[PDB]
Ligand binder design. Structure first.
Ligand SMILES: [Mg+2]
Ligand SMILES: [Mg+2]
Ligand SMILES: [Mg+2]
Ligand SMILES: [Mg+2]
Ligand SMILES: [Mg+2]
Ligand SMILES: [Mg+2]
Ligand SMILES: [Mg+2]
Ligand SMILES: [Mg+2]
Ligand SMILES: [Mg+2]
Ligand SMILES: [Mg+2]
Ligand SMILES: [Mg+2]
Ligand SMILES: [Mg+2]
Ligand SMILES: [Mg+2]
Ligand SMILES: [Mg+2]
Ligand SMILES: [Mg+2]
Ligand SMILES: [Mg+2]
Ligand SMILES: [Mg+2]
Ligand SMILES: [Mg+2]
Ligand SMILES: [Mg+2]
Ligand SMILES: [Mg+2]
Ligand SMILES: [Mg+2]
Ligand SMILES: [Mg+2]
Ligand SMILES: [Mg+2]
Ligand SMILES: [Mg+2]
Ligand SMILES: [Mg+2]
Ligand SMILES: [Mg+2]
Ligand SMILES: [Mg+2]
Ligand SMILES: [Mg+2]
Ligand SMILES: [Mg+2]
Ligand SMILES: [Mg+2]
Ligand SMILES: [Mg+2]
Ligand SMILES: [Mg+2]
Ligand SMILES: [Mg+2]
Ligand SMILES: [Mg+2]
Ligand SMILES: [Mg+2]
Ligand SMILES: [Mg+2]
Ligand SMILES: [Mg+2]
Ligand SMILES: [Mg+2]
Ligand SMILES: [Mg+2]
Ligand SMILES: [Mg+2]
Ligand SMILES: [Mg+2]
Ligand SMILES: [Mg+2]
Ligand SMILES: [Mg+2]
Ligand SMILES: [Mg+2]
Ligand SMILES: [Mg+2]
Ligand SMILES: [Mg+2]
Ligand SMILES: [Mg+2]
Ligand SMILES: [Mg+2]
Ligand SMILES: [Mg+2]
Ligand SMILES: [Mg+2]
Ligand SMILES: [Mg+2]
Ligand SMILES: [Mg+2]
Ligand SMILES: [Mg+2]
Ligand SMILES: [Mg+2]
Ligand SMILES: [Mg+2]
Ligand SMILES: [Mg+2]
Ligand SMILES: [Mg+2]
Ligand SMILES: [Mg+2]
Ligand SMILES: [Mg+2]
Ligand SMILES: [Mg+2]
Ligand SMILES: [Mg+2]
Ligand SMILES: [Mg+2]
Ligand SMILES: [Mg+2]
Ligand SMILES: [Mg+2]
Ligand SMILES: [Mg+2]
Ligand SMILES: [Mg+2]
Ligand SMILES: [Mg+2]
Ligand SMILES: [Mg+2]
Ligand SMILES: [Mg+2]
Ligand SMILES: [Mg+2]
Ligand SMILES: [Mg+2]
Ligand SMILES: [Mg+2]
Ligand SMILES: [Mg+2]
Ligand SMILES: [Mg+2]
Ligand SMILES: [Mg+2]
Ligand SMILES: [Mg+2]
Ligand SMILES: [Mg+2]
Ligand SMILES: [Mg+2]
Ligand SMILES: [Mg+2]
Ligand SMILES: [Mg+2]
Ligand SMILES: [Mg+2]
Ligand SMILES: [Mg+2]
Ligand SMILES: [Mg+2]
Ligand SMILES: [Mg+2]
Ligand SMILES: [Mg+2]
Ligand SMILES: [Mg+2]
Ligand SMILES: [Mg+2]
Ligand SMILES: [Mg+2]
Ligand SMILES: [Mg+2]
Ligand SMILES: [Mg+2]
Ligand SMILES: [Mg+2]
Ligand SMILES: [Mg+2]
Ligand SMILES: [Mg+2]
Ligand SMILES: [Mg+2]
Ligand SMILES: [Mg+2]
Ligand SMILES: [Mg+2]
Ligand SMILES: [Mg+2]
Ligand SMILES: [Mg+2]
Ligand SMILES: [Mg+2]
Ligand SMILES: [Mg+2]
Ligand SMILES: [Mg+2]
Ligand SMILES: [Mg+2]
Ligand SMILES: [Mg+2]
Ligand SMILES: [Mg+2]
Ligand SMILES: [Mg+2]
Ligand SMILES: [Mg+2]
Ligand SMILES: [Mg+2]
Ligand SMILES: [Mg+2]
Ligand SMILES: [Mg+2]
Ligand SMILES: [Mg+2]
Ligand SMILES: [Mg+2]
Ligand SMILES: [Mg+2]
Ligand SMILES: [Mg+2]
Ligand SMILES: [Mg+2]
Ligand SMILES: [Mg+2]
Ligand SMILES: [Mg+2]
Ligand SMILES: [Mg+2]
Ligand SMILES: [Mg+2]
Ligand SMILES: [Mg+2]
Ligand SMILES: [Mg+2]
Ligand SMILES: [Mg+2]
Ligand SMILES: [Mg+2]
Ligand SMILES: [Mg+2]
Ligand SMILES: [Mg+2]
Ligand SMILES: [Mg+2]
Ligand SMILES: [Mg+2]
Ligand SMILES: [Mg+2]
Ligand SMILES: [Mg+2]
Ligand SMILES: [Mg+2]
Ligand SMILES: [Mg+2]
Ligand SMILES: [Mg+2]
Ligand SMILES: [Mg+2]
Ligand SMILES: [Mg+2]
Ligand SMILES: [Mg+2]
Ligand SMILES: [Mg+2]
Ligand SMILES: [Mg+2]
Ligand SMILES: [Mg+2]
Ligand SMILES: [Mg+2]
Ligand SMILES: [Mg+2]
Ligand SMILES: [Mg+2]
Ligand SMILES: [Mg+2]
Ligand SMILES: [Mg+2]
Ligand SMILES: [Mg+2]
Ligand SMILES: [Mg+2]
Ligand SMILES: [Mg+2]
Ligand SMILES: [Mg+2]
Ligand SMILES: [Mg+2]
Ligand SMILES: [Mg+2]
Ligand SMILES: [Mg+2]
Ligand SMILES: [Mg+2]
Ligand SMILES: [Mg+2]
Ligand SMILES: [Mg+2]
Ligand SMILES: [Mg+2]
Ligand SMILES: [Mg+2]
Ligand SMILES: [Mg+2]
Ligand SMILES: [Mg+2]
Ligand SMILES: [Mg+2]
Ligand SMILES: [Mg+2]
Ligand SMILES: [Mg+2]
Ligand SMILES: [Mg+2]
Ligand SMILES: [Mg+2]
Lengths: 76, 59, 136, 188
RNA sequence: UCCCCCGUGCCCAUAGCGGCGUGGAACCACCCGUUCCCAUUCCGAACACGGAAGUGAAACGCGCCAGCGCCGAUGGUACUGGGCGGGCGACCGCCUGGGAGAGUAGGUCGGUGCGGGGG
RNA sequence: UCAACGGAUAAAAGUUACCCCGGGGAUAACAGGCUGAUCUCCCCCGAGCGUCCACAGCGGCGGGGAGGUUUGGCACCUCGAUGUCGGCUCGUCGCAUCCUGGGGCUGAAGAAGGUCCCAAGGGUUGGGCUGUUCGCCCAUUAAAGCGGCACGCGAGCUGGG
RNA sequence: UCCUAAAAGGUAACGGAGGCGCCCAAAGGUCCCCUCAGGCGGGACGGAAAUCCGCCGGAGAGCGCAAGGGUAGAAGGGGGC
RNA sequence: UAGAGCACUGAUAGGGCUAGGGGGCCCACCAGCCUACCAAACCCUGUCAAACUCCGAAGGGUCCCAGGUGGAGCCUGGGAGUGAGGGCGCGAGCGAUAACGUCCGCGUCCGAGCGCGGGAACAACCGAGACCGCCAGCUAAGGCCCCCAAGUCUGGGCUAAGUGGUAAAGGAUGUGGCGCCGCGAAGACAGCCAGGAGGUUGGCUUAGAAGCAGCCAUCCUUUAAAGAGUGCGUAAUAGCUCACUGGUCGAGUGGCGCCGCGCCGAAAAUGAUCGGGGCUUAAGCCCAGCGCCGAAGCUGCGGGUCUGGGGGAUGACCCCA
């Protein structure tokens, strides 16, 4: 036949969860398109990678129309 | 958190690993073995998930 | 039909949505056991039914096959089966309503549905009508 | 009709059926009460009553409530009623499925046609006082291939067609034996 | 304190569409004009500037009405960590804890924060 | 197109029935086995044929199953070896009975026959052609049965295949 | 790339179905501006479909190239530098 | 994901609406009408999907906090072996909703527990993890009539095939049990007695078609009852029967649905069988209860060894788990 093909696992999705400690630059969540938007102290790159720009805890915030944003609350 | 007497009566041999491990956090070696731990919401959980192996006693 | 070539096997769990109610007609035919019903089976019961009471009323065939029945031609394991040999089938689980007649006599129905039942592999029952719909 | 309804509370809905009582609930715009009836009773009572008339429920409270089954949950796996609703009425106009009696001699029958029907009960808005046992359906001058629509209905006073004024009511499809089969196997 | 309106943010349809009503002194828009800043691959329609007259028509604010949309119980039910039994098989059932979707009763044509102007 | 994409050399095809060594039942062919799609038979439904009459005889469309002969699937014991067709010799067992026995129905006058049921105790030919099994044919017969026994039998034989 | 995969990840078969071995100096960067497909109604050639006008139309277009995910509160359409 | 749903992506049974294509009316002035035809887009009824999802569980993953001293964990380093796995339950692909088939996943046992009890025997099913001793004791699975330890236990039902000793569509006044409805002491079911009439040879059809090849239509009278007629039958007629009415008759009678257990369907090859004998208000099956047998599991007594705790100039030894 001619079907047995498949690109190996890229292993994406949620890397960090709400209520977790994070340094500075920790890849919060690697995503396909933009299933998760940045926010407070969080930016993305070419592959839409989400990471922390400060140091604190990860937090999520669903906002329907706007989107499912994720931030980090800095503290020390 | 009154006492909680627990006697192992049903061998864990052949049962899921997690359950075996439960009789460790609860600490039950052999058969027909007594064990009177406290009644903490935590300790309860274990005893519960293996209730079918040990006959609980309210003390 | 029209979609694409082959499809999976998939088990036949509980007789859930595989089962309804008499929506049209007067009498109905229900399945008791779960299985795949073949196209040849639909027609077989169809022709049997309509042929019984010549110039019959309206025969409703609620079910409908669309599951590509797979199969291999007496060989080994070179890829996936060609299938299509027997054709297709329908997810028929207990409670389902394969057929139901109308505008005809009860005797015509009872005997017909009975015969068409033998055209089916599954043990079956014959339900009247009642009033079980959904209202007030 | 009547039905001795009892109050529920902490009974096992599953083990309850085993006993011989049919689980369910009665309620209106202001009500919500766990209840249950008897299988055999509700059985023979609902056969006639069905879901077109009103069945007063005599609770032990002596309360005679103008209720009608707003919905029935039919157990699959060999048909049988599992749960029952009982929507109570008051003085406010309420919607419901009203029976339709297809009476007459369709032109199809004469030409050897098929008695087709679609809505054996249309959903209509109406006051609790109005309990029309049914509506005269003038299906008679309906020939094979013709259809009577919802906009072609005779509505008893105090009532409106709470539907889509253009909804099919009945039809007259053709028979099917010899010609079709013999011709189908060769033209399929 | 409270009320009407202007800016802006949050909740992200119980605030949306639609038919009706309604406000211009104030606030807002339209509106007058295209000399100057500036502009439409054509147009000052858009963007822009100078500024009186006129209306509240358009837009918006507020309010109403549920037909559409949307929100949605409860009750039971499907399915199911866990424990157990029955049938050749396809499968079925009970105890324990969990528990939808759909449909019903029903809810809604907004709520709210800071600042600014006006009584 | 180190594209056999972690890339043995800068540089490479095929043949062995003349064959050999190491090793495997981790693996094919024989046989067994599990299965039963294929094969044999039985069965349900019964349009319809049979003047008439669906059941003398028959059966579409479709459904259930029994057996475990064939082809087939799996690769489980056996590769420090289980000899493989057919023939001969000796058989023995099954019954789904070819004959003889008995019996029902018949579209059974009688004879003869059809079909189904019961019933292995015994019997179930000689020959032409082919290695054949198989089958075709001659002559006859009460009949010239099907199948199991590693498609019985090579420490009994044959060796045409 | 997706499904198989049994709701984290991962996950096999000679399992189902389809791509890559490129292309772009503008298809990039910034700045400013802009909003789809279709449907209906109206209009010289055209007339199913060029182009223009009105109303509807929240993403079913577009996003170089398979598919997935994302997306007009721009990743899309155009101009300046 | 399970399920569920059709809001997108596709399939789809019927019906309406209606663009388009076929056919007929009819004149080419090119339209208008009908259509038990094919059928797009749209609506209603209804449903299918691994690669569809408006929705969406149980659950699983993870981080903070708490219990958890465990032949737990973490770090550095030494030494390994292993890289055919298998059965099983569950969730899927392939297969044929085949295989002691195969390919992943979650767990489990076997592996290496072929050590023990049960299952007749039997790597993996049920019970249970063998440090050694003992002519002690309770119990597990299973079992408690004889081979065989321990009840021919107790009480209440079912089953007459040996079912149990375990095959299907489908078949059957088998036998018992529950609910609904018809009919009946103002006289029921059945057998039995007699009748069961005319138009009409219902229309048509046909060689005929007279209740009874077929089609369609689809009365009146007499009466206690007799049908524009159910079958057998005839070439068509006759003739019989039945539902019907009365007499008889004398007490029940008929139908449906659901449930328990058994019967048919049931044909294989060296001798036969549930392990055997043998069993029938059970020694079968269902329900409720007490009692007992029974493993190397547990308790009892004694002993070895290793680890951990204590007395301890005392090394030492003693005791404990
Ligand atoms: Mg692969
Ligand atoms: Mg591969
Ligand atoms: Mg792969
Ligand atoms: Mg690889
Ligand atoms: Mg173990
Ligand atoms: Mg866990
Ligand atoms: Mg098609
Ligand atoms: Mg299923
Ligand atoms: Mg077929
Ligand atoms: Mg059948
Ligand atoms: Mg089949
Ligand atoms: Mg049946
Ligand atoms: Mg009562
Ligand atoms: Mg106005
Ligand atoms: Mg005004
Ligand atoms: Mg100018
Ligand atoms: Mg100036
Ligand atoms: Mg200038
Ligand atoms: Mg200008
Ligand atoms: Mg302007
Ligand atoms: Mg000026
Ligand atoms: Mg003014
Ligand atoms: Mg004004
Ligand atoms: Mg206005
Ligand atoms: Mg405002
Ligand atoms: Mg809902
Ligand atoms: Mg709900
Ligand atoms: Mg309402
Ligand atoms: Mg509503
Ligand atoms: Mg408004
Ligand atoms: Mg506020
Ligand atoms: Mg004021
Ligand atoms: Mg004032
Ligand atoms: Mg190459
Ligand atoms: Mg090289
Ligand atoms: Mg290589
Ligand atoms: Mg090379
Ligand atoms: Mg190389
Ligand atoms: Mg080479
Ligand atoms: Mg040679
Ligand atoms: Mg030589
Ligand atoms: Mg030579
Ligand atoms: Mg060799
Ligand atoms: Mg072989
Ligand atoms: Mg072999
Ligand atoms: Mg062998
Ligand atoms: Mg077979
Ligand atoms: Mg048979
Ligand atoms: Mg036959
Ligand atoms: Mg044939
Ligand atoms: Mg044919
Ligand atoms: Mg065929
Ligand atoms: Mg056949
Ligand atoms: Mg078949
Ligand atoms: Mg068959
Ligand atoms: Mg079979
Ligand atoms: Mg074989
Ligand atoms: Mg092997
Ligand atoms: Mg060798
Ligand atoms: Mg040897
Ligand atoms: Mg040898
Ligand atoms: Mg040897
Ligand atoms: Mg001899
Ligand atoms: Mg004879
Ligand atoms: Mg004879
Ligand atoms: Mg004779
Ligand atoms: Mg003769
Ligand atoms: Mg003899
Ligand atoms: Mg010879
Ligand atoms: Mg010779
Ligand atoms: Mg010669
Ligand atoms: Mg010869
Ligand atoms: Mg010869
Ligand atoms: Mg020949
Ligand atoms: Mg001869
Ligand atoms: Mg022989
Ligand atoms: Mg041989
Ligand atoms: Mg031999
Ligand atoms: Mg020899
Ligand atoms: Mg030989
Ligand atoms: Mg020998
Ligand atoms: Mg020689
Ligand atoms: Mg020769
Ligand atoms: Mg030779
Ligand atoms: Mg997935
Ligand atoms: Mg996953
Ligand atoms: Mg597949
Ligand atoms: Mg290039
Ligand atoms: Mg650019
Ligand atoms: Mg750019
Ligand atoms: Mg523009
Ligand atoms: Mg358009
Ligand atoms: Mg147009
Ligand atoms: Mg136009
Ligand atoms: Mg246009
Ligand atoms: Mg021109
Ligand atoms: Mg145009
Ligand atoms: Mg146009
Ligand atoms: Mg157009
Ligand atoms: Mg760009
Ligand atoms: Mg740009
Ligand atoms: Mg640019
Ligand atoms: Mg799935
Ligand atoms: Mg799914
Ligand atoms: Mg599903
Ligand atoms: Mg829908
Ligand atoms: Mg498409
Ligand atoms: Mg369609
Ligand atoms: Mg359709
Ligand atoms: Mg047309
Ligand atoms: Mg035409
Ligand atoms: Mg003329
Ligand atoms: Mg013309
Ligand atoms: Mg012309
Ligand atoms: Mg004309
Ligand atoms: Mg459509
Ligand atoms: Mg519905
Ligand atoms: Mg369907
Ligand atoms: Mg946790
Ligand atoms: Mg802390
Ligand atoms: Mg702390
Ligand atoms: Mg801590
Ligand atoms: Mg802690
Ligand atoms: Mg410790
Ligand atoms: Mg350890
Ligand atoms: Mg260990
Ligand atoms: Mg090491
Ligand atoms: Mg290796
Ligand atoms: Mg599987
Ligand atoms: Mg294997
Ligand atoms: Mg295996
Ligand atoms: Mg395993
Ligand atoms: Mg081991
Ligand atoms: Mg182990
Ligand atoms: Mg082990
Ligand atoms: Mg040994
Ligand atoms: Mg044993
Ligand atoms: Mg053993
Ligand atoms: Mg000991
Ligand atoms: Mg004892
Ligand atoms: Mg016992
Ligand atoms: Mg015994
Ligand atoms: Mg007894
Ligand atoms: Mg026996
Ligand atoms: Mg009967
Ligand atoms: Mg009398
Ligand atoms: Mg009588
Ligand atoms: Mg009688
Ligand atoms: Mg006369
Ligand atoms: Mg005549
Ligand atoms: Mg026999
Ligand atoms: Mg024998
Ligand atoms: Mg036994
Ligand atoms: Mg007992
Ligand atoms: Mg013992
Ligand atoms: Mg011991
Ligand atoms: Mg003791
Ligand atoms: Mg003790
Ligand atoms: Mg000391
Ligand atoms: Mg010391
Ligand atoms: Mg010492």
């Amino acid at each position: 036949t001619k079907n047995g093909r498949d690109s190996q696992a890229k292993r994406l999705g949620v890397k960090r969860y709400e209520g977790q400690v994070v340094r500075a630059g920790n890849i919060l969540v690697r995503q396909r398109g933009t299933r998760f938007k940045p926010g407070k102290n969080v930016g993305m790159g070419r592959d839409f990678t989400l990471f922390a720009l400060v140091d604190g805890v990860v937090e999520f915030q669903d906002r329907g129309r706007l989107g499912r944003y994720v931030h980090v609350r800095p503290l020390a | 958190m009154p006492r909680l007497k627990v006697k192992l009566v049903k061998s864990p041999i052949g049962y899921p690993k997690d359950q075996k491990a439960a009789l460790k956090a609860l600490g039950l070696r052999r058969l027909q073995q007594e064990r009177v731990l406290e009644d903490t919401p935590a300790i309860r959980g274990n005893v519960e998930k293996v209730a079918h192996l040990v006959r609980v006693e309210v003390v | 039909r029209m979609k694409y070539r082959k499809q999976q096997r998939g088990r036949l769990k509980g007789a859930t949505k595989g089962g309804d109610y008499v929506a049209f007609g007067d009498f109905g035919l229900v399945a008791l056991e779960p299985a795949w019903i073949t196209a040849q089976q639909i027609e077989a019961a169809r022709v049997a039914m309509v042929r019984h009471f010549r110039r019959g009323g309206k025969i409703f065939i609620r079910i409908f096959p669309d599951k590509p029945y797979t199969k291999k031609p007496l060989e080994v394991r070179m890829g996936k089966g060609k299938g299509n040999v027997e054709g297709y089938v329908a997810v028929v689980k207990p409670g389902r309503v394969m057929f139901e007649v109308a505008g005809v006599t009860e005797e015509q129905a009872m005997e017909a549905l009975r015969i068409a039942g033998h055209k089916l592999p599954i043990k079956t029952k014959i339900v009247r009508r009642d009033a079980y719909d959904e209202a007030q | 009709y009547r039905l001795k309804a009892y109050y529920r509370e902490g009974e096992k809905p599953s083990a309850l059926r085993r006993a011989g009582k049919l689980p369910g609930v009665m309620y209106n715009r202001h009500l919500n009460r766990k209840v249950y009836v008897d299988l055999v009773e509700f059985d023979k009572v609902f056969r006639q009553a069905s879901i077109h008339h009103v069945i007063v429920l005599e609770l032990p409270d002596g309360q005679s409530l103008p209720t009608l089954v707003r919905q029935v949950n039919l157990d699959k796996r060999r048909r049988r009623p599992e749960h029952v609703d009982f929507f109570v009425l008051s003085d406010e106009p309420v919607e419901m499925y009203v029976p339709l009696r297809f009476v007459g001699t369709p032109a199809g029958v004469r030409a050897g046609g098929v008695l087709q029907e679609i809505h054996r009960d249309i959903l209509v808005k109406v006051s609790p006082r109005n309990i029309p046992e049914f509506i005269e359906v003038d299906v008679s001058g309906l020939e094979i291939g013709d259809s009577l629509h919802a906009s072609d209905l005779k509505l008893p006073p105090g009532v409106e067609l709470a539907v889509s004024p253009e909804e099919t009511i009945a039809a007259v499809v053709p028979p099917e034996d010899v010609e079709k089969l013999a011709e189908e196997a060769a033209a399929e």
